[model samples]
Target: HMADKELKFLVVDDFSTMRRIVRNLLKELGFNNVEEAEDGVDALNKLQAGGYGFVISDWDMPNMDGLELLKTIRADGAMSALPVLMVTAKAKKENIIAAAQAGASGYVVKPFTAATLEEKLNKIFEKLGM
Candidate 1:
């Protein structure tokens, strides 16, 4: 589960409520170093500022969008290896494939449970050594 890592998480979503919910959930899971961005562009700005060890972003967002955010992060040599988990309402198979092809560390659909989140995180941890 990568319990040894003390990671700072970035929760990027367009809705403030969703961001708060995710932040609280992460805190409940023993991750207190969590930050939020209202949208993809804002998230990118924060990411560039540094200190984020992981990113959990929504699929749909204003400005750059989650896919763009993922691409941008991967494009940079310094941030390319950063683990990004895409949490979104996108349940379509095509979208999932796109995310996988885009190099997302993990993907979770909306209305997911804590167990689901934990499972996805574990998978990412195992795959990326995060």
Candidate 2:
């Protein structure tokens, strides 16, 4: 799987460290235009600032969680079709199911690997023809 090279991305996590980690992996996959946010609220703010094409969002966060963020994105007309990859460590099929029903583009279990991220990204990109 290869990145689109310049598509802008938002990596969202409560922890700054995790956001950095996700951003680095995305960079290694050839996605260099990456930004970050603290949580769903912060994410939404950055998104509102505009130009985010993809989102890697952590499920657990203060103020608002990734699930809520995903729903908001799906509901918004301007960004409804934007790709959001839910990041969770719950390892629960229920959670995955919830994300799917909520219209997530895809999901990733926590402790994400470079290869795993790349694989999931390709699936979304291929299906959407992005």
Candidate 3:
């Protein structure tokens, strides 16, 4: 299915560089409505404000990691079903397994290609029928 182009996306990462890259990549993919949050702490507050449809999160953020954020989103009644895609520096088999266990909608390694991001994003949207 072709997902809604208007779906609002939150890019959560501590580094400005990574967030900017993801934002630009998403723009190229036709998803222009993107927002950036410094960490999970800020991300969650923005999420609670409502209307965010997708999340791109980093695993090693200060204050709160993406794993913690993903788990919280899954546990919350209001936004439990929202999609969270992990885009972080962790490349260990164990970490990805843990992310899957935490209910991440998708996972991507750091320095991922724009194609990689798009592929993962679309797969999650397709799975959700969004």
Candidate 4:
């Protein structure tokens, strides 16, 4: 768990309800510096604006997709090392493998519980030594 709750989080999802859910869950996890994006394109724009420490994104979206966003972030020098957690409904073996290959910090299937989210966040933070 983060001792500093100030790390800014970006929640990217095409659905408003999903975005709200993630934001609320993050708040419950003691993270209040959170923002929402309707899709990957919107997310990228926000990323470019700076001060984002983490990203929680959906796999499917319009204008740009989560996979592409992840790849782009990995390629960008400014945010290449940023932690990205994929929180999506895509529950395929291949997608999981692909996300790992593409450099996701963690992957959470849709219908995920708060415990699962907390576990994944802990794992990622520990791995990063944050």
TM-score of each model, paired residue for residue: 0.93, 0.94, 0.96, 0.96
Task: Please report, as a residue range, the 10-residue window in candidate 1 with the lowest summed lDDT.
Answer: 1-10
lDDT of 3 at 95: 98
lDDT of each residue in 47-127, candidate 1, tens digit only: 889988889999899887899899888889989988999999999999999988999989999989988998888788788
Query: For model 2, how does the per-residue alpha-carbon lDDT over 1-130 read when each residue is reduced to its tens digit?
Result: 1247879999998888788888888878788899999889999999999988899899999999999999999999999988999877867899999999999999989887878888998899998888
lDDT of 4 by residue, 1-130 (tens): 2437898999999999889888998899889999999998999999999999899999899999999999999999999999999999999999999999999999999998889989998899899887
Q: Tell me the lDDT of model 3 at 21.
A: 96
Report RMSD for candidate 4.
1.5
Better of 2 and 4 by TM-score: 4
Q: lDDT of each model, Cα atoms only?
A: 0.87, 0.88, 0.90, 0.92
Minimum summed lDDT over a 10-residue window in model 3 is located at 1-10
TM-score of 2: 0.94
Specify the poorest-scoring 10-residue window by lDDT in model 4.
1-10
Clashes counted in candidate 2 amount to 0
Q: Stretches of candidate 4 above 4 Å error?
A: 1-3
